Chain length 183, copies 3
């Protein structure tokens, strides 16, 4: 019960532009009051599979949202599927779906919901990953905590790029970050 | 110490003094994972010299430093930029009722990161990172963290904030950065 | 036994171009399903000690490989010496070589060995470190999991730079990353 994950296989579990068009590999490991997070993305099909900005200049970014309720349970309006998001057992999941993961949630005082109080940048982490493992193919991964509505908690991943890529497959290197846990 | 968290609390009440008294909120969370400390940091400047940056009118205002000084027991010293009042072990979204006496297991390893001496100074006592002002991807600032290079203390952690862009009326409040370092014990 | 390391002293322990020409400082700390890794390098002698790309225009990269068997034991073809790699005991290592460290190995489902199947980039982590702690002397540290032959598991560090450095000592700042554990 110290690790919440997608499993490490490559079976599509995520819907960006069309049903199960991607594998988001996300591993959350509870190190007390901090969650250690490891993420990568493979797109297998649809609009974001093969990037061509000569042909499609406007395709420059997309977002993957994980929305959670009071008990830390993934809501079905998330881009990530509920089917294999669960606590770890081996290279797989526990047999039954979890009902509480509040200790894996981003801290609401650290990272508050939108309000008429001043909005601070500390609820964001920026990173850069590399498409196809090539050092001249950067894309920015921007992670934001608790800024979606219709949820108690949220983790959102925005992927974007500034280069004009021609036929570059969107599959990434891995990035590690952390965040402050709710409890 | 095992698995505990030493932190500033995660609210936005100013706890830190850069240019003038309580001009900033340093949010710092140190979590012990055995022989390494997992660190998470951000900064909000609320007042004074470094609150709103304009390098057109003031091209030479480009960097500043925040120091955490520790004694032999890992207790924060009063002359650190960070105030002692809310630097303590975690309890809920606040701190334990007793001001801590021992945190040597949270201190940067002195063999890995020695104090200044006339022996060769190696770069491994530094971690560089980049954070973004206002959460804007075109507003980077460098956060340089250095271990055990201060004097008048047994241990130290120093944060130097710098930028090479010419900012015009930009509020210095940052995204978050994560790093680790080797623990003394 | 929760940390495998090199001892954080300055005594050479690694062979890049000639015997004991470097000190690799590597600390691997098990946080359940993830290994938290911290790395830096000091080159003390030989070809890579002082970089001069006026004199030697093509000297722009090198690699340090850690190769492991089925029990997570370091193999002798590794650049890092076997005598220097063990579980932590104080500021030193235990006197006896360990027999098992499978819990510290990179996960083979997450990071499979080379094959005829499609290779994904998530077995790579990119970072940048700074020579001599100077902010204008970046070098790229590319870390790759389980891609070497002659082993069950591997961690390889490729160091490279694009700048024309003139008489710059190769000793680095520190970088942190994580990876998914085999067990
Ligand atoms: C971590 C790796 C890294 O820094 N990659 C950077 C890359 C390389 O430095 C050079 O291409 C030499 O390989 O240069 C960029 O300007 C590019 O778009 O190509 C930005 C990348 O972020
Ligand atoms: C992680 C985010 C990131 O890399 N930001 C970089 C930024 C963006 O790539 C572009 O502005 C396109 O958004 O480019 C810079 O040259 C800039 O100062 O603008 C350096 C920043 O570090
Ligand atoms: C974290 C530190 C950092 O970003 N360093 C970058 C550096 C500094 O921004 C400037 O020298 C101003 O100090 O600019 C570079 O183009 C350079 O080669 O000099 C790339 C470095 O990666
Ligand atoms: Zn494909
Ligand atoms: Zn302000
Ligand atoms: Zn020399």
């Amino acid at each position: 019960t110290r690790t919440l994950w997608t499993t490490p296989d490559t079976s599509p579990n995520c819907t960006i532009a069309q049903d199960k068009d991607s594998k988001l590999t996300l591993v959350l490991t509870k190190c007390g009051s901090q969650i250690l997070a490891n993420v990568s993305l493979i797109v297998v099909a649809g609009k974001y599979h093969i990037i061509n900005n000569k042909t499609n200049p406007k395709i420059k970014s997309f977002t993957i949202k994980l929305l959670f309720n009071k008990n830390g349970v993934l809501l079905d309006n998330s881009n990530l599927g509920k089917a294999y998001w669960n606590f770890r057992s081996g290279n797989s999941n526990v047999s039954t779906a979890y009902e509480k993961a509040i200790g894996f949630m981003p801290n609401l005082v650290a990272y508050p919901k939108p309000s008429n109080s001043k909005k601070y940048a500390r609820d964001i982490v920026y990173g850069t990953i590399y498409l196809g493992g090539k050092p001249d193919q950067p894309a920015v991964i921007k992670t934001t905590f608790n800024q979606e509505t219709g949820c108690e908690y949220s983790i959102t991943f925005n992927f974007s790029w500034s280069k004009t890529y021609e036929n570059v497959e969107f599959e990434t290197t891995s990035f590690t970050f952390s965040y402050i846990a709710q409890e």
